[PDB]
Structures are given as structure tokens and as C-alpha cells.
Design an enzyme around this catalytic site. Structure first.
Site, short mmCIF file in Angstrom:
data_model
loop_
_atom_site.label_atom_id
_atom_site.label_comp_id
_atom_site.label_asym_id
_atom_site.label_seq_id
_atom_site.Cartn_x
_atom_site.Cartn_y
_atom_site.Cartn_z
N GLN D 32 8.30 4.14 14.05
CA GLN D 32 7.13 4.94 13.71
C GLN D 32 6.86 5.97 14.80
OE1 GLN D 32 5.29 4.66 10.67
NE2 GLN D 32 7.07 3.36 10.24
N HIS D 123 20.11 12.74 23.64
CA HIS D 123 19.32 11.96 22.69
C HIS D 123 20.15 10.92 21.96
CE1 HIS D 123 20.59 15.38 20.01
NE2 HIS D 123 20.85 14.36 19.22
N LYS D 345 7.09 36.73 29.24
CA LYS D 345 7.58 37.99 28.71
C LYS D 345 9.11 38.01 28.73
CE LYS D 345 6.09 42.26 27.51
NZ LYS D 345 7.03 43.28 26.90
N1 LIG Z 1 7.02 0.48 4.65
C1 LIG Z 1 6.66 1.77 4.64
N2 LIG Z 1 6.25 2.35 3.51
C2 LIG Z 1 5.91 3.65 3.68
C3 LIG Z 1 5.95 4.40 4.85
N3 LIG Z 1 5.53 5.70 4.63
C4 LIG Z 1 5.24 5.72 3.35
N4 LIG Z 1 5.46 4.52 2.71
C5 LIG Z 1 5.21 4.18 1.30
O1 LIG Z 1 3.86 3.83 1.11
C6 LIG Z 1 3.56 2.93 0.05
C7 LIG Z 1 2.90 1.67 0.60
N5 LIG Z 1 3.87 0.76 1.20
C8 LIG Z 1 3.59 -0.47 1.67
O2 LIG Z 1 4.50 -1.20 2.08
C9 LIG Z 1 2.15 -0.95 1.69
C10 LIG Z 1 2.07 -2.38 2.20
C11 LIG Z 1 0.71 -3.04 2.32
C12 LIG Z 1 0.34 -3.86 1.10
N6 LIG Z 1 0.17 -3.03 -0.09
C13 LIG Z 1 1.03 -3.02 -1.11
O3 LIG Z 1 0.88 -2.27 -2.08
C14 LIG Z 1 2.20 -3.96 -1.09
C15 LIG Z 1 1.89 -5.28 -1.32
C16 LIG Z 1 2.87 -6.30 -1.34
C17 LIG Z 1 2.53 -7.65 -1.59
C18 LIG Z 1 3.50 -8.60 -1.58
BR1 LIG Z 1 3.01 -10.42 -1.90
C19 LIG Z 1 4.85 -8.29 -1.37
C20 LIG Z 1 5.20 -7.00 -1.14
C21 LIG Z 1 4.24 -5.95 -1.12
C22 LIG Z 1 4.55 -4.58 -0.89
BR2 LIG Z 1 6.35 -4.04 -0.59
C23 LIG Z 1 3.56 -3.61 -0.87
O4 LIG Z 1 3.91 -2.32 -0.65
C24 LIG Z 1 6.39 3.76 6.05
O5 LIG Z 1 6.47 4.25 7.19
N7 LIG Z 1 6.72 2.43 5.84
#
Ligand SMILES: Nc1nc2c(ncn2COCCNC(=O)CCCCNC(=O)c2cc3cc(Br)ccc3c(Br)c2O)c(=O)[nH]1
Ligand SMILES: Nc1nc2c(ncn2COCCNC(=O)CCCCNC(=O)c2cc3cc(Br)ccc3c(Br)c2O)c(=O)[nH]1
Ligand SMILES: Nc1nc2c(ncn2COCCNC(=O)CCCCNC(=O)c2cc3cc(Br)ccc3c(Br)c2O)c(=O)[nH]1
Ligand SMILES: Nc1nc2c(ncn2COCCNC(=O)CCCCNC(=O)c2cc3cc(Br)ccc3c(Br)c2O)c(=O)[nH]1
Ligand SMILES: [Fe+3]
Ligand SMILES: [Fe+3]
Ligand SMILES: [Fe+3]
Ligand SMILES: [Fe+3]
EC number: 3.1.5.-
Lengths: 453, 430, 452, 435
Positions: D32, D123, D345
Site C-alpha cells: 500500500q 529501485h 532557470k
Molecule cells: N483488497 C483490495 N481491494 C481493493 C483495493 N483497492 C480497491 N479494491 C477493491 O475494493 C473493493 C472492496 N474490497 C474488499 O476487499 C473489501 C473488504 C472488506 C469487507 N467488505 C466486503 O465487501 C468483503 C467482505 C467479505 C466477507 C467474507 Br466472509 C469473505 C470475503 C469478503 C470480501 Br473479498 C470482501 O471484499 C486494495 O488495495 N485492496
């Protein structure tokens, strides 16, 4: 390999790829003929940019037909769309206008009716006849076989797309493809919702040459298009969000119809050209099959003679010296000097039966026979009148689909004819009397009271 | 009185009624039947446009520019009479074009009558005079302020230049206007710097019909255009930063010249149309003054016959039944089936050598008379060859096509060609 | 430095900028906007949503110019001057000068939770930040260099940003007379949803989110005019242009339904707010005279607020002070994707809508709800987040038929006006079940829509 | 245990599916971190739409790596591409930029060489270090085994894709790599490629930098994927395409050009980069970043500890600008100059004639030698090294631009004198500017 697709650079569609079969159909005298039939007929004599001919538009229709059927096959493979079906739809789009005559809708919509009232001829039947003639005068059936087409079925299919069904059985009328593919008959010409690639091309191209703005985006429509079942019938449906694009198209449709296709001087010039043809029809000879000589009005009975019937006829009259064509020549000369027939008025058969083509020739006489209640100084002949009947095709009868329900439709649940009159005599007295005769005729025919002053 | 024409490039074009009286004449309406780009249409489906549209546009731009200069700089004493004269010059600058435009005066007439010196500009002056006299427009000129003597002369000089009869001296040649209004001669036809409203209109219109991008902004040039003094001489100049627009023009110009005007297949088709005309020139009759019969190649001698010489001739050949035109008819039929002459090679004349039109007819024979510096077999006739001369402001190209398509006939052709380039000390083809 | 600078934006091509606008842009107060993400925490859901308030502000100023200049040229009767154009462009540039860390999160959730007694809007902050920008740099003399009358013209720009600065039925504005009323409709407009602000951020958020946008703002500007309605000069459109407007409203719905109201997006916003709240006592921002402020009080001093930016987030995330471990830990949860858990959604349909002054009380009410069946687990207010999601909402737009160019044509969607979501900071199954029971009972007590 | 495919919506590639293992690697502080490092460094200060960061780009590369490796494996079952291999390549794609520092190439291409000339830092080295730190600070090795990877040899394979042959033996042509055998050599060409310049990294940042800069991009990367092959040349497996697709290849190289001139070599852009570096340098002594065991590091030594480096990001910039410590005013003022647009400059540009390339270890010396150049035409103002910036722009081919921090007309004329003479003393191209 053997042959190859070719690129045509069109100003509306850009790079057009063409399957070699389509090219073999294009490089034929029967098709190249369309380079000599102006799309908008006499509109050119009003809009300087309307130099374009049926040939360009036909290529565009073929290209758009291919794009759309290909998109539906890519998105919905369950339709069993084959590359053979694609080719047939492209051939139908290419040839939908093969049958037009000199100055396009002027010929089948005014001249033939006035020259042969007993004949029922339309450009679509002409297209089917010309297509057959093009197939046989060149060697196109074996090429169809060389590229997978079945000439019997596929020729039937192409012709059925152009002219319609051969019938009150309510069973499947078409024979070139089965009912499981009914939607392909809605690609090139659609009478239901009037959404076909033919109108897409001529809307865009006529706006481009006329200087009219056109905000319809056909590629965006094709992208979000899909087949869906509306009333136990497979139809081409549009995404729910695409309505805005459809507004922009129908507005283009109206702007073209009001500003161009129904231009007052444009239509007067069309009828002046018809007057010359009629006054030349007996003296102009066109060689057809077997050396037999046909006239302008009878060329449609022989496709070999019709192949040489074109806007050229206009200059053949204009440039002639034969005294027998003096009458005809002189009318075209007035067009050049801009001494046109003068507009008397407009009316509509609102509420009444619509005028048929078989009666067009009788209308001038009716007008000259109308008895104004105020008796008139000058008296006018039927020859002094032109009676112009303008028909129009024709909010939303368009099937849509919900973004998540792409299988079923949503279930959401101007005029047809104008009549103008022009006069050949131009002195104020003659034109006043023309208006009197005309108002009285509109009263006699229970037509709408003209309101031109 | 004031007529409005709606054009796709310029929008609403108003036309002074005098200009309208000049338009509604058989001599001007003739331009509706002469394709701007000649045979280019047979390669670009969108190039259906004709000299008539272009002429109206040139007239409109001429008027816009001279009127704008009159408003910005009233001290120039530009009159509405001057405006009308320039507009008429713009309207009528192309009256003299023939069938398929530059095909006619730049290849057909040279090959048909090599002795004659004919150009479309002289033709424009002739048609213009003929248009003046066959209609009654001189008294109409007088009715709208023009003096036909001086003003007719001024218009024709804008179209063709000065009557070449000076003492080849540095004195003022034109007779229609004084030198204090010299800038008026730079609006319709230039050549000093190659910027005129003719080019503005046909660049914009040919781009519009060919699908080519054009970001030159003729309206902005008019806005920032003024008259200024260059070497004690009044010339039409532009503000410095407008250079960006003019670059956009030359890139447009080059894009048009290579992509369309010098198209390989387009020019081959152009010579096929020319071949048909040549093979029809003896049998086609065109009636002129007093009923006299002229041929395609002699219409330029009588403006009454020339008024009826247009692209129509092409279809008059194609649709004909006379067996004598079969030769010509068949070539046009060959165009329809797309069985074109074959491209053999391209070369250029070195240095400042330029092939003159009077010599065009000899070129095929020279090729057939050249003995490949390496002795071979197959021998070909001069009739089997086409030699195309393509011009470009200063430079000149020479392409060669063969009418015979046998794999061997074309192999032998490429040799006649390389040897020809050697004999005339031309550039070795690739 | 006097010259028209040229900037390249991905939405709008060459953006030409009058030197006055450039002098306003090259200040710390304006450059601040490079460090405030447009969609706040949406970046943590939409990886392409890296854009900031700065690019957007440039765009709004540009479109303001495009429109006002088009109207003035098509209708010279309006007496639009180049002075008017500039005032409208400056208002467009600075309409967002007041946004705080993570844009609408700061004034729409954080400040109401941290200081319920206070009434703060990003527009008030814009007008304040604008005054501070004017005075901290030499702007007023430059305005005089280019024809502006700073006295009333500053008033006009501020009035465009916040509304009538300060009651009868007469003309409230003081920067321009009523015959120029249409100028107050370019940058912000409320009656309908047609202003250059929404034009730019509709197109830019679509560009960065991957959404298709079919609205052609250049078309609209080209066919726009000033017309009379009722008896008010206002911006009107062609009847013809209705098709374009459909697409614009469709873009609005797609942005609101899948971006501005994204579930996880709003969850992460509330997590960021939770961190800020747990850090407000310990984070110091130096302001005027060296006085120190907190995140929640920097809005009261534009010198400190100049330095209150999304940077706060990382100042917390990288911190070592034990007093801040609480705040830091929440942000680290974000990095691990251990987010607050969604419980349900409801609406105050038919009820009085929830006001900001009550936001702080919502957790607690939910925790005090007495389910009919009692759970093992008991949950505390701190275990609940109550997210109030407001939005501004067929045809409330004015049109002109071609031949009726100064008269409306006379016309004689499926979005709530308030959403209420609840999340639980406890994440085990048993506690989440408990949370659902508490949440539905609260909805019943409040007579809110019955949750899913 | 069993998880699900995670869908992310990207503006360039659209719906991107991510295997849960990739997500476990993405949801770490070390990854991140990339959300806070701008892709084009200081170019944002010239191109307002270039707000994008290394994070979204990294996701894109991981995605394209997967797409391509999968296409090759599907059309050519003979290559024996395994889903394990696919994952290894996707992780390499994700993590190829884990090592970047504040403002991307500004950090390892200018700042570090000036602050620590003796040190050799790139890098890519940083990526391999950060990747190891990420693996160990989180529970990634057991998860890797949960989804089939062999961490021992596969972690080596991912590192080898990022940095190259993890060692340098005395074996000529023999296979230097150890994470995969030579019969899978083409896998090392997907993410990073130097032999001809075609890899999924450049695909992603060409298309994304065009998207955010406003530049038009003609390359269609998935037509490449559809028409890609692995073929043998010189008894060596290599990624090759179809000759008809050559039109696409040229289209990409024009993009490579259009981006490099208009954006990556922008004059004002690179000037601002050197100003940021100058701020960092004048601040490197006084800013603290806490690393392992609570040790404190500087911007210049944070690279020596991946724990502190996890917290070294573009935030540095604002930590300087928002500071009150008087020790940092010198740095702060430079950044404030950027905000007021009173920039260094430009004086002139030259190139090192022939095949000469100034090495990074020498960057610090360049201003100084410039100041000692004896302009033959004796002049008014004497300028010292501190008054000079020497920007080395690499992309073979190297440009050397010179800027002066003094802005009065007299000092700039003097500066051009010093610069032209320097080019002569070094036998560099005559500065053909003559402003
Ligand atoms: N990982 C990542 N995704 C990223 C990024 N940047 C954009 N996005 C995409 O955003 C969408 C949200 N993604 C999430 O993971 C939200 C997690 C919080 C919970 N809410 C949920 O809806 C959710 C609930 C679950 C419940 C169970 Br039981 C099992 C699996 C689950 C999954 Br899988 C879920 O998603 C980034 O940097 N990282
Ligand atoms: N002259 C010229 N115009 C040209 C050309 N090509 C495009 N346009 C532009 O016009 C298109 C039609 N409108 C005109 O005005 C032109 C026709 C005029 C016919 N003659 C008349 O007497 C006359 C008749 C009218 C009937 C009505 Br209903 C209403 C107004 C009328 C007026 Br006004 C007249 O003058 C071209 O080749 N020549
Ligand atoms: N059959 C038939 N063709 C027709 C007719 N009317 C117009 N065309 C079109 O053909 C004329 C040539 N097209 C152009 O010049 C396009 C302009 C842009 C530059 N393009 C080329 O240089 C060019 C590219 C090609 C690519 C492929 Br793959 C295959 C063949 C190509 C040829 Br050939 C090319 O010239 C008609 O009536 N019949
Ligand atoms: N005051 C202030 N200015 C600011 C700020 N942020 C950004 N800027 C804007 O200035 C940045 C410095 N720009 C210059 O020096 C001039 C750039 C010269 C152009 N360079 C190109 O690469 C380029 C070339 C093109 C060629 C063609 Br053909 C067509 C389009 C092109 C485009 Br689009 C291009 O971009 C801020 O905060 N403040
Ligand atoms: Fe059609
Ligand atoms: Fe011309
Ligand atoms: Fe905004
Ligand atoms: Fe990368």
C-alpha cells in the site's frame, strides 16, 4: 488466400474492409451504375453539397450491416450466427438500392406513376431484379459457393431482405432463413421501428453533405445492441440507457425530412425533371436485351436497358439538338436559368383516404376543373398545374432491454401525406387564379384548408 | 434579392443578386457536371463533389476576405464594386475546366493536340466572356455599380493574369486596377506565395469529402489578415503568430497532395479515362455555334460546344452503341470490372529538367524504342505503354503503366522502363 | 508575470489561463488542492481514483470561461464584459478552495462528529480560504492591473461560491445586479443539476473510474443561451439538446450509484474519520502567530487550514507517539483490509431527515435499541458506525424552441434523498449478528424503512 | 482457508481479477506504500492530470503478466506453463516497483547519487529487498504453500524476474538463473526485458501515462497477447509475434517516443524534479524516519532498512513544506519557490559525444567542475558550484541540461558562459541553443 479483402476510405465510416465476394459484386456494371444516380435527386439543385450518389451510400449500408450482425454474433453466440449469414446480410445491404432510377425517389415515386399509372413499380422490386441480373451477367454464383454461400437459399434470403415476403397464414413467411433467425430481417430494412443500417448511413451521409448536425452515434448503438424476445418474437433491442442516442437520431430524422427531403424548391425541381422526362419519353431510346429499344418509362422491364438508365438521361436531354426533344430540353433549360414552377399551396388529406399513385395523373385535371365561387378572369389548363404528392415513412415503438434482463424486452406499456400544387404560368393573374382553383379543390376533396396566407 | 445557399463547409453563403444572375446560366451550371477530383472518385467514394460547389465557395471566401480588409483598413479605398469584381473572379475562376478537371487540360488535350497551348485558366476567361455575352449581364453589372470595360478586364486578369505583352519590364502590368490596389490581385489566384482563397476552399472541401483531417482555420486567417507594405509594394500579410495556422495549412496541403492527388490507382484510372477519350475523339460529335460539329479535342475552340462538354462524355461513351466507339467503350468497361493498367515503375527527371506537355505524346514510343541495355527477348509496342507526368509546384514525377497484363509482358515492360530512365539520364527506379 | 499560460488536462485539451488566474493558482493556498483526493477514500476502492481537487478546480475555471464567453458572444445584448468572464473564471477556480482532508468526508462527517455545535461547510471554507489567498499574496493590485474592481468583484466571486452572503423577496446579491442574474448559475446551480462544476467532475471521475460518459459539454455550451422564465434571466438549452441531457443525468446516476455511494468506499471513509477523531487531541497544526490547532479546529484559522490536507492521514500512519497508537491502528486496519463490517441500510422515508448536529448521537441509539430476543453478545456505542449519506437527487431544466429564443417551452429519478448505513467495528460472526438485531430494532424505533 | 477471486475496476484494463494470494500480497503496508509515490515523480507539477501513483500501475503489470503468461500457456501446451508459474509471474509483475522511493525515478536516479555517491542503489534492488520484507512481516510463505507455490525456489524466481540473475558467476552462456530451468527461459522476459524493450511493465505505463497525460496511444496490447508466441532463435526460447502485427509494434514505439519527449523529458518538469531533490538534500540532515528496532534514519539512509523505507514516500515533500523547525527553512523555501512558480532557470543542453556516459557516482561533481570552467570572455559575476544544477537525463543516449539557481539576467548570461566552456573542456556537443 486466393483473393483478399480491400480497404475503401469513406468519409463517414473511415476504413471499410470488404470481403472479396462483396468486391466481385461491386466491380460490375450493374453496381457501378450507382455512381451516376444522385442520392437526393434534385436536392443537389438546392443544396450544393448534395453531390453524392447511391454508390457511396450502398457501400456504407453494406459495411454497417456487417458491423451489426457481427456484433450480435460476438455478444450473443446462442443465435447461431454464421459467417455465411454475415455475408448474406452484407450483400443485402450493399444491393438494397440497386434498383433506383434517375434521381432516386423521383423515378419510382413520381415519374413511373405519371408515365404508367397501370404499372405498380417500386425501387425495391427493381433492386431484386437488378441483383438477379448482376448475379447472372457476371459469374457470382460460383464465387458464392467458393465462400460457403448456398446460392439457392442465400439468394432468396438476400432478396427477401430487400423486398420483404412473397399471405395471411401468420406462419413464418420467409424461406431464405428460418424463423429462429427472424431478427436478421430487421438489419437492412425495418418497418416496425424504422431502425436499420440503411437509415443510419443515409442520415449520416446526407447530414455530412447538407451541413446538418447529426449527433446519433451508430457505433455506440451497435455496441449496446442485443437480440431479445418481445412478444414471443426475436427482435433487435436496445439498452435502456441508449434512449438518449435514439432521441438524437429521431431529431436528425426530422431535421433531414423537414429541411431537405421536403424542401419546397427541391420538390418543385424534382417535378420539373419529371415533366422533362415525360415530354422526352417517346423520343429517347435505350438499347436493352436483344437489341430491343426501350424508352425511359419502359427500361424497368429489361434490366440490360435499365443498367444504362441514370442521371445521364438528364444531360442527354439537356445537350440534345433533335427538334423532337425541344419541349423536354426547354424545361431543363428553365432549371438552369432558375425559372422554376411557382409554388401555389400545400394541403393534407387529413381525415380522408390517401391519394394513390394510380391517380396522380388525374390530379392536375381535377384542380383545373374546380369551380371557385368567385369566377375568375384567367382560365387555366390542366397542363398548367403540377400536383405533388409527398409521402413519409413513419414516438417510440422501439424494443428495449433492462441491463440485467437481456433476454426480454422492458414492456413500456409528422404526417403520412402532403399535397403541394405548383403552377407553370407565372404572371400574378394566373397565379391568383391557380390559388383559387386550388383552395376550391381542397374544399371539394375535403382536404385541409391551405394556410399559406 | 439576396439568395442564401447552404454549403457544408462554409454554412450560409449569401450571394449578391448580380452573382446570382451569373450563376443561373448554362455556362456556370455546367460546373455541376465536372467532378472536382476527376477520377479520384473511382478511388475515394466520398469524392463525388464537382467544380460548382467549389466555385461558390471560392466566391464566398473572396468576398469575405476583401470585405474584411475593407473594414479593417478603410484607407485602402476598397469599394463594393471592387468586392463584387473579386467575388466574380472567385466564382468564375474554374469556368474553363473540362471533363474530369485537371485530367483534361493536363493530359488529354496535350495527348490529343500536342501543338496546342491550352490551359483551364484561358478557358475560364473564354467561358466567362461567353457567359457575359450569351446572357444579358453587362447591363446588370451596370445596374449594380460595375463598369464592364475596366471591371471585366479586372476579373479576367484575376483569373489568368496580365495580358502577356510587356517589354518584360519591372513596370505595372495589370490594366483592370491600379498598383495602389495591387493586393486585390492576390485574393483569388496568387502564385507569389501560393496562398489564395481557391486553395482555402478546395483544401477544406477535398478534406471534407476525402475523410482527411483539416485544422487550418480560414476564418481566423481572415480575422488576422491585413494589407502591409513589402518592398514598397502592397501585399496581403498576416500577423506573426498566425504562422501556426499556416503550418497547419501546408501540412494539410502536403497531406492532400500525396494521399489523393498523386494516388497510384487514381492516376492510373485517370489515364484509362484519357485513353477512352482518345479512342473516341474521332467519333463523338459536339455541336457548337451554327451547328458546327466539334470533337472532344476541339470543343475548346468553340465555347458553345464546350458548354456541353463535361463528365457526361464518359457515360456517352459507356452507354454507346456505335461499333466504332467499341474500343473506347471497352476501356471504360475495363474500369468498371476494375481491370486496370498495371504499375511498372516510377522515376523523376533530375535537376531542373521538366517534360513539357508538347512532348507527352512521344514518351510511350521512346520507352518502346529503348533497347534494354542487356539484350533480351519479348518486345513491346508503344501503344502498350502509358507514361504519366505528375506535377507539384516545382518537382515532377513520371510513372509508367503497361496495358498488357501478362506476367511476361510486365516483366519486359519494367525493363523498357529502367533502360528508358538510363537513356534520358533519369533516376534509377527502385 | 503577464502572459496566457497553457496547461494540458486529460479531460479538456489546452487550457489557456489569463495571467490573473495564474497569479491566483501559484499560491500555497491554491496549490493546497494538489494534496486532497477528489473522491476521498474512494481511491482505496478505485485504484484509478488518484486525482485531486487541483486538476478539477482548473477544469471548472476553464469551463466557466468557455460558457460565459460563449453566451456573451452569441448574445451581445447581455452586456457581458471580459471583467465578467474573469470573475466567473476565478469563482470556478476557487469554488473548492475550502475542502479539507478527503473532500466531502471532512465537512460532511468529521467536523459534525468532532464539533456538533459547529456549522461548517466547504463553501464557507472556500470563501474564507479565498480571502486568505487574496491577502496573503498581492492579488488585489493584480486585479486592478486587469480591470477588476476588487471591492464589488470579490463580493461577486464569493457570492458565486457560497450563495447570498447574507430577508425580503428582492435581489439578494450585491456583486452584480439582477439583469446579470444568469452569472450566478454557471459555477453552482441548485434548481437543476447543470453547472460547470458538475460538468468537469462528472467527466473527470468517469475518466479515472472507468465509467463511460456520453455527455458532450461542448455541445451544450454551443447551444446554450440566456432566456426568460417566469420573469428571471436564466441559462436555457435547445429543445434539440434534450438527448444530451439524458446522458448527463445517466452519468450522474452511475457516478452516485457505483462510486459516491460505494459500500466499502463509504466504510473506509468512516474508518478514516474514526482515526482522525482518535487523533484530534494529539495532532498539532501551526497557524497564525504560531498558535497551535487540531484537525477539528484548523478550520477556524486559514493559515493552519492551508496545511490541513490528506497528509494528515500519513502523519498518523507513520507516527510513533503512543498517544496516537489508537488512531494509527485504525489506519493500519485499512492497509490490511480488515475493514468495519456492513450491517444494513435504511432510509428515513416519510420521517424528518437526520441532521448533522445529531450524527454523534446515532451510535448509542443503535446500541440502546432493545431487540425482542436478547443476544449473548452486548455491544457498546464505540462498536457502531452510523453513516448518513445525503444526496441532492426528472426535468427541472429550462428549454427554448428555436424560434422562441427568449422563452421557456413550458413543461406545465430513482434515488433517495437520505441513506442511513450501519457498520460494526467488531468483526466476529456472533457480534455481527448481535449488531443486526440492534440495527433493525433502532430502525423500528425511528420508523425508518425496514432493512433488507 | 478457501477464498475467492477479487475484482478491481481499472480505467485502463477494466475488471481485473486477482487470485487471493495476490490480494494477500497487496493488503500489506509494504505494498500500500505505493499509493503514496507518484508514477511520473514531479511531472504532476507540469501535467495536472498525472496524479497517478505506483500502486495502480503495479496492479496493472501484475494483471498483464497474468494475461500474457496464460495466453502463451494456453496456445502452446508444450511449454509446460503451470498455474504456479502464472502466479509467480503475476507476483513479479505486482512487485517489480515495490522498491521505488519518493517521486519514483527522481529518488534512485538523482537524489541518492547526490546524497551518497559511493553507494550503488537502484529501485530494482529496492524491490527485491522490500519484497523480502513484505514476505516476512506478513504470513505470506504459508499462504503461498496453501496455493501451490514452493516458496524456496519460487521466491527466488520472482526476485530473478525483478532484478535479474541474483548472482554473477564465471559461466558463459550457461544458465545463470536458478528459479526456473532454461526450457522456461521466456518467463524471465514477460515482466522485465532489456534485449529489445517489450515487457508488460512498459505496456501498462505507456497506456496509463498516456491516459493521464492526455497523449494519444495507438498500441493495442491485447492484440499483441492474442498474436504472441514463444519461438526458438539461436537455440534460445524467446517471445516473438506475427509479422502482420508489426504495425502494432511501430505504433508502440511512437508512443514510447511521444511520451519520452513530451512528458519524461519535459524541461520544466525535470527542473522541478531537481528542485525537489535540492529540497531533500538541504533537508536530509534534519528529517528523521524511524526504522527497525526504533533506529532513526534519514531520507538518504532509509534505503538501508526496509522497515523505515516502508514509511519513506512522497509524504516527505509535505513534511518539509509544513515544517516549523528552523533547521529546515532552507529546504522549505525551495519547495515554496515551486509553489510560487519561481523556478530554477534553464541555461542549456548538451550531450556526451560518442559512447560516453556520465556515471551516477560522478553526478555530485558536475556542478563543481562547471563552476571552475574558465570562460575565455572575462565577465562580471562569479558563480559557484552551489549556483549550478547539472541534470543527467538517461533514456544509450544521454542529455545533460544545466540550470542556474540565480535568476537575474547578469548571472544567467554568466551561467551560459560557464556552461559553453564546460562543454568544451569535456569535449561535449557545442550547446546549439543560442537563445
Ligand atoms: N483488497 C483490495 N481491494 C481493493 C483495493 N483497492 C480497491 N479494491 C477493491 O475494493 C473493493 C472492496 N474490497 C474488499 O476487499 C473489501 C473488504 C472488506 C469487507 N467488505 C466486503 O465487501 C468483503 C467482505 C467479505 C466477507 C467474507 Br466472509 C469473505 C470475503 C469478503 C470480501 Br473479498 C470482501 O471484499 C486494495 O488495495 N485492496
Ligand atoms: N439561384 C440559385 N440558388 C441556388 C442554387 N443552388 C442552390 N440555391 C439556393 O436556393 C435553394 C432554393 N431557394 C432559392 O432561393 C433558390 C430558388 C429560386 C427559384 N427562383 C425564383 O424566382 C424564386 C422562387 C422562390 C420560391 C419560394 Br417557395 C420561395 C422563395 C423563392 C425565391 Br427567393 C426565388 O427567387 C443555384 O444554382 N442557383
Ligand atoms: N474494387 C473497388 N475498389 C474501390 C472502388 N472505389 C474505391 N475503391 C477503393 O480502392 C481504391 C484504393 N483505395 C485507397 O486508395 C484508399 C485510400 C488510402 C490509402 N490506401 C491504399 O493505398 C491502399 C490500401 C490497400 C489495402 C489493402 Br488490405 C488492399 C488494397 C489496398 C489498396 Br488497392 C490501396 O490503394 C470500386 O468501385 N471498386
Ligand atoms: N503556473 C502554473 N503552471 C502550471 C502548474 N501545473 C502545471 N502548469 C503548466 O505549466 C507546466 C509547464 N509548461 C510549459 O512550460 C509549456 C509546455 C509546452 C508543451 N509541452 C508538451 O510536452 C506538450 C506539447 C504538445 C504539442 C502539441 Br502539437 C499538442 C499538444 C501538446 C501538449 Br498538451 C503538451 O503538453 C501550476 O501549478 N502552475
Ligand atoms: Fe439506402
Ligand atoms: Fe479552384
Ligand atoms: Fe468542484
Ligand atoms: Fe513499472
Amino acid at each position: 488466400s486466393m483473393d483478399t479483402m480491400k480497404v475503401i476510405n469513406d468519409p463517414i465510416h473511415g476504413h471499410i474492409e470488404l470481403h472479396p465476394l462483396l468486391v466481385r459484386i461491386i466491380d460490375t456494371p450493374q453496381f457501378q451504375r450507382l455512381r451516376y444516380i444522385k442520392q437526393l435527386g434534385g436536392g443537389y439543385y438546392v443544396f450544393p453539397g448534395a453531390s453524392h450518389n447511391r454508390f457511396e451510400h450502398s457501400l456504407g449500408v453494406g459495411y454497417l450491416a456487417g458491423c451489426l450482425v457481427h456484433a450480435l454474433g460476438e455478444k450473443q453466440p446462442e443465435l447461431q450466427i454464421s459467417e455465411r449469414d454475415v455475408l448474406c446480410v452484407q450483400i443485402a445491404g450493399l444491393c438494397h438500392d440497386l434498383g433506383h432510377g434517375p434521381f432516386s425517389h423521383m423515378f419510382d415515386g413520381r415519374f413511373i406513376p405519371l408515365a404508367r399509372p397501370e404499372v405498380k413499380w417500386t425501387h425495391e422490386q427493381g433492386s431484386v431484379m437488378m441483383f438477379e441480373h448482376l448475379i447472372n451477367s457476371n459469374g457470382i454464383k460460383p464465387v458464392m459457393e467458393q465462400y460457403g454461400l448456398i446460392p439457392e437459399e442465400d439468394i432468396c434470403f438476400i432478396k427477401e431482405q430487400i423486398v420483404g415476403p412473397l399471405v395471411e397464414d401468420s406462419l413464418w413467411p420467409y424461406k431464405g432463413r428460418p424463423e429462429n433467425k427472424s431478427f436478421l430481417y430487421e438489419i437492412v430494412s425495418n418497418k416496425r421501428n424504422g431502425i436499420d443500417v440503411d437509415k443510419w448511413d443515409y442520415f449520416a451521409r446526407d447530414c455530412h453533405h447538407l451541413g446538418i448536425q447529426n449527433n446519433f452515434d451508430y457505433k455506440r448503438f451497435i455496441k449496446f445492441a442485443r437480440v431479445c424476445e418481445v412478444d414471443n418474437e426475436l427482435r433487435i433491442c436496445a439498452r435502456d440507457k441508449e434512449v438518449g442516442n435514439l432521441y438524437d437520431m429521431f431529431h436528425t430524422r426530422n431535421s433531414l425530412h423537414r429541411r431537405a427531403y421536403q424542401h419546397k424548391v427541391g420538390n418543385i425541381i424534382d417535378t420539373m425533371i419529371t415533366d422533362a422526362f415525360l415530354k422526352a419519353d417517346d423520343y429517347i431510346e435505350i438499347t436493352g436485351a436483344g437489341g430491343k429499344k426501350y424508352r425511359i418509362s419502359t427500361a424497368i422491364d429489361d434490366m440490360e436497358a435499365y443498367t444504362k438508365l441514370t442521371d445521364n438521361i438528364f444531360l442527354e436531354i439537356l445537350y440534345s439538338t433533335d427538334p423532337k426533344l425541344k419541349d423536354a430540353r426547354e424545361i431543363l433549360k428553365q432549371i438552369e436559368y432558375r425559372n422554376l414552377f411557382k409554388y401555389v399551396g400545400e394541403t393534407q388529406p387529413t381525415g380522408q383516404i390517401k391519394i394513390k399513385r394510380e391517380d396522380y395523373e388525374s390530379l392536375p385535371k381535377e384542380v383545373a376543373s374546380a369551380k371557385p365561387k368567385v369566377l375568375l378572369d384567367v382560365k387555366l389548363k390542366a397542363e398548367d398545374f403540377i400536383v405533388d404528392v409527398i409521402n413519409m415513412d413513419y414516438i417510440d415503438h422501439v424494443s428495449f432491454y433492462c441491463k440485467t434482463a437481456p433476454n426480454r424486452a422492458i414492456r413500456i406499456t409528422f404526417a403520412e401525406q402532403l399535397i403541394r400544387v405548383y403552377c407553370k404560368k407565372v404572371d400574378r393573374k394566373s397565379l391568383y387564379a391557380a390559388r383559387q382553383y386550388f383552395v376550391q379543390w381542397c374544399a371539394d376533396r375535403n382536404f385541409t384548408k391551405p394556410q399559406d396566407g
